[PDB]
Amino acid sequence: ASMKDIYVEFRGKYKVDGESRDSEHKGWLEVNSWSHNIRQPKSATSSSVGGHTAERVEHSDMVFVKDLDATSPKLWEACSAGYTFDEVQIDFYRANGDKRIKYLQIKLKHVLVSSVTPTVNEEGVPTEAFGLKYAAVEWTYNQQDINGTAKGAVTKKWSLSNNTASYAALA
Amino acid sequence: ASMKDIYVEFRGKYKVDGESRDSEHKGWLEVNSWSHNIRQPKSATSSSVGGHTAERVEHSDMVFVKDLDATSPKLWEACSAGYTFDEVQIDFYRANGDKRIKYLQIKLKHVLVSSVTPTVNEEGVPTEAFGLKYAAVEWTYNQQDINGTAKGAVTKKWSLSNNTASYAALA
Amino acid sequence: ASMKDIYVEFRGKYKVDGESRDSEHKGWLEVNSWSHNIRQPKSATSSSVGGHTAERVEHSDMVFVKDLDATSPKLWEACSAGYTFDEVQIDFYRANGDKRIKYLQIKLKHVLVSSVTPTVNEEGVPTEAFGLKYAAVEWTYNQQDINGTAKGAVTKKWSLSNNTASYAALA
Amino acid sequence: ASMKDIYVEFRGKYKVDGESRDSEHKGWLEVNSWSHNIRQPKSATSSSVGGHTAERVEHSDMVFVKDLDATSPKLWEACSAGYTFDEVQIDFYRANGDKRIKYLQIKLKHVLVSSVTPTVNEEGVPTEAFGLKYAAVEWTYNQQDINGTAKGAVTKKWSLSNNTASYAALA
Amino acid sequence: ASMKDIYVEFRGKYKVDGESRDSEHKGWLEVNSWSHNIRQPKSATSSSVGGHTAERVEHSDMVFVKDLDATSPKLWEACSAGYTFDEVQIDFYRANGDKRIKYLQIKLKHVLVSSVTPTVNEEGVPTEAFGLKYAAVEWTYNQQDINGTAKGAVTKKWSLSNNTASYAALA
Amino acid sequence: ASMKDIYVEFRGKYKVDGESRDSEHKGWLEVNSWSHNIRQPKSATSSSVGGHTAERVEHSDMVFVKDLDATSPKLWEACSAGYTFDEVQIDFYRANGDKRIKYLQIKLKHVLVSSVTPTVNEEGVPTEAFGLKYAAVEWTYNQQDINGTAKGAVTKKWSLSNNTASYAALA
């Protein structure tokens, strides 16, 4: 059984409350897909004489696709206004034998809706893409052993605003 | 039963009266599809020292596709002349069990036809794309409960001319 | 029964006499398809202080596709020479129950062949695309009632050379 | 029966003798397809005060596709050297009931091979595209009546080097 | 039987320990595909008067595609931070009758993760592309005789940082 | 029976010895496809007053696709180093009834590997494209009569370094 599901929750002063009725994500947004891109310009053939490298990594926006729903106008206005959210969390699920597993969890700190792109076609459920831009990110991947049983998590992080491996927006 | 339908009405001094015979949209335009794009350039890693952020959101034109019909020359001339309409309303429908639901309603204030792109091919019903540019927008999404019964509406808005969350073109 | 047909007639000093044997369009060109584009740059968020707006609409060429035939060299030479035609008329037909209807009629005033693009492939009837550029246009769409019976025509027009809604090239 | 065939003959000091064994085109090149493009920049909304218009038409190269054969190295060298040919003739054939008809004939005056693009793939007969650039062109289209019987030819021409409707390279 | 498999191991201060349970690559990353590009600008029609040629080869990043797994956040952070690895080794396998053969082995010296591009779609196993940039490379191709039996290896190398055929990053 | 085959031999100080076991090409590289492009900028509507034309032909690299094999690292290093080869020969074969014919032979003088682009995918035999840049070329096409029996060869040539029809790199 496929048990794929992705859920998003906004946490800030402005509310983007979703429609999900999943017991573990009541009021979260249900989304269909996710894509990202990270690009590091640092040279492998030149090095700084000292401890300062000018360039830094570029993180692209995280882009999600979702069905149009009651959260859509909320996203459209939030994008237009440039409202900042303290945190956004995204949980990713897949099948794990008899129950699902949250294999990936992403937390974004100091977040804006950078784009929304809605369409209604003649055929098919209407959908929109939306992008998120952020100051810091914490990624957690949940491992399992050969029996599919949960082993330890791998947690990594990056602060674009501090240029350090921290889940922190401020200095 | 699929009950998809999109209807557009122009409201201004210049008439773009449509062909629809739908009881609830007599004389509106029937259209086939819609697409939009909203892009916010605001940074998540830098902030203004004060309360002024230079950049603002960019709303792309709202683009509709429709069959060529008697409104087509009206659109072609309105686009050519750059006539402004006080308001344009778009109603979006889908199935809701035994009757249809208007799941999305968009009102645009101070509107121009920014483009029209008609084609007649050897095969298929002739169609055209047309785009609308506007000073302000009000979006209403009509929610339903788990039984499909109407719950409360979500209404949001944005004024490009005022740079505020208002359905107003003028200051 | 599909009764799709498009006919073009050039009216000027230089003759581009066609091959059609249709009783109502003897010697017109038979063409297969048509495409156009109209783009209005006027802003919806800024307005002139006075009555003058700098920019004007851009009409793209009207582009037609036709089978290669005896008119082809006539088009190739007319395009090369830049001959101007006083008028070009295009009639568009579709089925209307037992007889066809001219649903769209376009008249172009002060017209040049702006491009011709012929091909002969290994397979298929050879065809060419050709484009027309013009000073003014009159568009007529022929309406029908719910019984398919002719109702009134919708006629609109635009003069690119006068920047007014007129079917006139000269001032 | 399809009787499609295109034949090309070079006429100049440098020989590009072909492989055809067709009785009417012995030693011509057999080619598979042809494409061209003619673009006229003249405005329909502005006119010269006098009798001089600056811009002129742009004729693209005539591009042919053919199987690789013994003429291929001849084309490759002629293109490399920039050899000029006094004339190149191209005859185009299609079915006409019981016999074929030369529906199109093109003569090019003062001609260069402007490009050659050969490929050998794992599958399929190797082919190359080649382009011809020229000073003047004469196009002849052979008409037929409703019975398919030959009627009169349509002959048109253009000199790029003289900017007149003449089949002449020199002044 | 297809026995295709590609394995990657990072060797540096920062750990990117993988998930593989293959007996010969325990804890390596399993990857699905690889692509590269090498471009030499040196002219064949001009030569230096002396022994110095200005330009040098450009090696593109080596790009791998892999399933998302517990190493993914490790790659995302390593790319973000620009961590350098002393060495990365990649082993490539295919079938060789009754057992597999390592037909290609690549060692990269002084290596950075230059890009990572993860996606989760509605359908299909989530994957990411990642790119590696490096100072030097050693390529080993393992040959076999007509009986499929191992013959001698072909080993070649290049140092981008020294511009010589050496597997060395430093001078 | 298809008897398509392409073989390449490098002849220079640096060895790029191939894997072929074909009796007539022992140790040559077997390749799968070939593509080229030759472009002549000379005008057909303007001519030099004297005997000097500034521009010259541009030959693109000759691009080959081959399976990855033991020659691959040799190509990768040769490209990286910019090694020059005195000559490279390419023989092209197709079926000729009961035996194959070498229909095309290309010799390149003073040659560099200008690019190599290898890929290993999940499915399919790994392949690479490689390009060759050169100072001169001799092309030989082997003709046959209507009975498929060998007739005379057509040999043509071009020197990019001398700008003459010669198979010579040096002056």
Residue numbers in the entry:
A (entry chain A), B (entry chain A), C (entry chain A), D (entry chain A), E (entry chain A), F (entry chain A): -1 to 169
Sentences from the paper on this structure:
Hcp (haemolysin conjugated protein) and VgrG (valine-glycine repeat protein G), products of the genes tssD and tssI, are the homologues of the bacteriophage tail gp19 and the tail spike complex (gp27)3-(gp5)3, respectively. Based in this analogy, these proteins are thought to be molecular markers of a functional T6SS and they may form the needle of this secretion system.
Conversely, the C-terminal tagged Hcp crystals diffracted up to 1.55 Å, the highest resolution as yet reported for a molecule of this type. The Hcp structure revealed a tight β-barrel domain (12 Å diameter) formed by two β-sheets that are comprised of 4 and 5 strands each. The barrel is flanked by a 10-residue α-helix (from Ser70 to Gly80) and a loop, formed by the residues His34 to Asp59, that protrudes more than 25 Å from the core. There are three molecules (0.1 Å RMSD between their Cα atoms) in the asymmetric unit that are packed in a down-up-up fashion, with a distance of 30 Å between chains A and B (head to head arrangement), 20 Å between chains B and C (head to tail) and less than 10 Å between chains C and a symmetry related chain A from the next unit cell (tail to tail). Using the 6-fold crystallographic symmetry, one hexameric ring can be generated from each Hcp chain interacting between them in both, head-to-head and head-to tail behavior. The average contact area between intra-ring molecules is 1325 Å2, with 19 inter-chain hydrogen bonds. The inner diameter of this donut-shaped hexamer is 40 Å and the outer one is 80 Å. Although the A. baumannii Hcp protein forms a nanotube, its packing is unique among these structures, as the 3 chains interact both head-to-tail and head-to-head within the same crystal. All these data suggest that the predominant oligomeric state of Hcp in solution is as a hexamer and hence the model of inter-ring interactions for this structure would be the result of the crystal packing in this particular condition.
